[PDB]
Amino acid sequence: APRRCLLSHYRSLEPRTLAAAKALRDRYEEEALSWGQRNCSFRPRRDPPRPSSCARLRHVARGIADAQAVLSGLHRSELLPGAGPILELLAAAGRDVAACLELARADSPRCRKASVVFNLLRLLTWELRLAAHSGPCL
Amino acid sequence: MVPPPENVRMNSVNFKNILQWESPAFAKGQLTFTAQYLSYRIFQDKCMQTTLTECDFSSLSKYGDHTLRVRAEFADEHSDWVQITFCPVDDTIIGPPGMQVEVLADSLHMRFLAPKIENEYETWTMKDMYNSWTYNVQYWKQGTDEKFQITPQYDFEVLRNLEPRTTYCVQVRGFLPDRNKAGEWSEPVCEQTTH
Amino acid sequence: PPQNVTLLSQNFSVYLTWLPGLGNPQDVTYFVAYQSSPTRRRWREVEECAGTKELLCSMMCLKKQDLYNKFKGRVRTVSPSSKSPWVESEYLDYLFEVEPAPPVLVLTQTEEILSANATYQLPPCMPPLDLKYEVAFWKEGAGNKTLFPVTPHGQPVQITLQPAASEHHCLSARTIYTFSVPKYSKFSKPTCFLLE
Numbered sequence: 470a471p472r473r474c475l476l477s478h479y480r481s482l483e484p485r486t487l488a489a490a491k492a493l494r495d496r497y498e499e500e501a502l503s504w505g506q507r508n509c510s511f512r513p514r515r516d517p518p519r520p521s522s523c524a525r526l527r528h529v530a531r532g533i534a535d536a537q538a539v540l541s542g543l544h545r546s547e548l549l550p551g552a553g554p555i556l557e558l559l560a561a562a563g564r565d566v567a568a569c570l571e572l573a574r575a576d577s578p579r580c581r582k583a584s585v586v587f588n589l590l591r592l593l594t595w596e597l598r599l600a601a602h603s604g605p606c607l
Numbered sequence: 608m609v610p611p612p613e614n615v616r617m618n619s620v621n622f623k624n625i626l627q628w629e630s631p632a633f634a635k636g637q638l639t640f641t642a643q644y645l646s647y648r649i650f651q652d653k654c655m656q657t658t659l660t661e662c663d664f665s666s667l668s669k670y671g672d673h674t675l676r677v678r679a680e681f682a683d684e685h686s687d688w689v690q691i692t693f694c695p696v697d698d699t700i701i702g703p704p705g706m707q708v709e710v711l712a713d714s715l716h717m718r719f720l721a722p723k724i725e726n727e728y729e730t731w732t733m734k735d736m737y738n739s740w741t742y743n744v745q746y747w748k749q750g751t752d753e754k755f756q757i758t759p760q761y762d763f764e765v766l767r768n769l770e771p772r773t774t775y776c777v778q779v780r781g782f783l784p785d786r787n788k789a790g791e792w793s794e795p796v797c798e799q800t801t802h
Numbered sequence: 803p804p805q806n807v808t809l810l811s812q813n814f815s816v817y818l819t820w821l822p823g824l825g826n827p828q829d830v831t832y833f834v835a836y837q838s839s840p841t842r843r844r845w846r847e848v849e850e851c852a853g854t855k856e857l858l859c860s861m862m863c864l865k866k867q868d869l870y871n872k873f874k875g876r877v878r879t880v881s882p883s884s885k886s887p888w889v890e891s892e893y894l895d896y897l898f899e900v901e902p903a904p905p906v907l908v909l910t911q912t913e914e915i916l917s918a919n920a921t922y923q924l925p926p927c928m929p930p931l932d933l934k935y936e937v938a939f940w941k942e943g944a945g946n947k948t949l950f951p952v953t954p955h956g957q958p959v960q961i962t963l964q965p966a967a968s969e970h971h972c973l974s975a976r977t978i979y980t981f982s983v984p985k986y987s988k989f990s991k992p993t994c995f996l997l998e
């Protein structure tokens with residue numbers, strides 16, 4: 470049987486998960502400060518939101534996938550630990566978002582990794598909350 | 608030769624995961640147990656050489672599925688792995704929410720308190736976890752046992768026009784309208800309305 | 803130069819405050835700029851505080867501030883003769899250091915039901931966050947405070963009104979902010995009022 474949409478429970482994330490994400494971002498910041506500034510710009514640029522529901526689900530899915538890839542690759546090298554809870558929640562959220570979507574119908578890698586690490590909190594708290602309020606594609 | 612564990616279950620109420628199993632019919636001696644959980648494609652030994660027949664897994668995240676796997680060991684010798692899968696966000700059950708019932712005249716006031724997760728703060732309850740949450744209530748005059756159902760929109764409910772000097776028994780539970788998964792009817796509390 | 807440049811948070815808002823050093827003239831104005839934790843090279847300057855003699859300047863609503871990420875501020879003393887070097891401030895992360903404030907309790911009474919709906923004055927543009935509030939209810943001489951279970955923002959706390967004489971019942975509320983760690987606010991001023 471096809472899996473039902475259970476995005477409604479992502480409106481309020483677990484406090485310990487958010488604390489772990491904060492610790493991970495702090496560790497990444499400490500690593501960036503220890504080795505010195507990075508030439509490539511990694512400003513957490515604003516992402517233009519849209520009122521469309523299915524487009525919002527697709528965008529949050531893309532963000533989830535990119536963040537999961539970057540954090541898993543970083544964790545493979547064991548540069549910074551504590552990404553376990555974040556990685557498993559990213560996998561779960563991506564699985565649920567993809568299930569809902571299917572049921573309804575030369576920049577350096579360093580600055581990209583910094584950007585996704587910085588925007589991880591915004592994606593977990595803002596974009597995921599809007600996606601949960603959105604539900605399945607209309 | 609060591610018999611494997613039988614009847615392995617994962618009892619999870621309010622995300623209080625406890626994996627239990629039944630000890631097997633080993634001929635004699637001591638039969639210990641070893642339970643592990645899959646993480647990053649390698650099993651981590653949650654419990655090793657434990658005498659108890661159960662082990663808690665509440666340390667694992669409430670997000671994402673897990674694979675639990677326990678065997679029985681007889682000193683150097685060992686037995687075959689018995690393994691289950693467990694999704695805490697879907698395979699858990701919601702405990703009976705707390706009830707505050709106060710009866711005045713012919714009116715019964717009802718306050719519902721969401722079940723609490725033992726690993727989180729008192730502010731983050733099961734209601735916060737399952738955001739699309741509702742309270743269901745069934746009440747009946749004592750003995751009649753005619754379940755009248757009322758579904759409050761908030762954590763308060765006021766039943767009115769109660770026939771005096773007759774006890775009414777009520778129960779509450781946590782319903783999840785989106786997935787259609789009910790919780791556990793709270794203890795049936797019986798109140799005698801004031802004359 | 804301002805001696806004590808400090809970036810703090812009060813009532814869901816971020817304020818940069820400072821007191822200056824002796825010897826400066828009485829015609830000095832203040833120029834203030836904010837810097838985010840990422841892309842530290844950027845030093846965006848705050849227009850509402852630009853050239854203002856005020857020693858306090860709000861930071862919650864700025865040109866482009868990601869409350870998710872950490873940010874700091876710097877202040878300088880500007881005079882027609884010369885401008886002092888900037889004095890920076892320690893970093894502040896909003897969602898992990900925002901100080902909440904008690905709400906305003908809109909009191910609606912029924913014949914036997916009293917509602918204590920909480921209204922909040924949140925900054926126009928801030929990240930949505932848990933706003934559960936605890937309500938303390940008591941009598942003018944009882945002393946002991948009846949604490950009700952926390953309820954989310956937008957949910958009136960409901961109090962049964964047991965019939966009795968008209969007494970001066972007092973009420974108050976406290977904001978509980980639980981983004982990642984519960985941050986309790988202070989109990990508001992009691993709204994003491996007669997109840998029949």
Ligand SMILES: *[C@@H]1O[C@H](CO)[C@@H](O[C@@H]2O[C@H](CO)[C@@H](O[C@@H]3O[C@H](CO)[C@@H](O)[C@H](O)[C@@H]3O)[C@H](O)[C@H]2NC(C)=O)[C@H](O)[C@H]1NC(C)=O
Pocket residue numbers: 919920921955956957958
């Ligand atoms: C108790 O106080 C809360 C305070 O939040 C009241 O809830 C608020 O009710 C107003 C309507 O009177 C809502 O405004 C509406 O917001 C939507 C966006 O969600 C907007 O599109 C509408 O045009 C309208 O402006 C407001 O959102 C809502 N806030 C919350 C947090 O629920 C509530 O009505 C009061 N009374 C009771 C009985 O709860």
Ligand SMILES: *[C@@H]1O[C@H](CO)[C@@H](O[C@@H]2O[C@H](CO)[C@@H](O)[C@H](O)[C@H]2NC(C)=O)[C@H](O)[C@H]1NC(C)=O
Pocket residue numbers: 805806
């Ligand atoms: C403002 O800054 C001044 C200077 O840094 C602080 O003055 C110091 O206060 C501590 C308090 O224990 C004393 O031990 C020091 O002797 C003071 N002088 C110096 C040079 O450190 C002051 O505390 C700060 N705060 C306020 C409210 O004035």
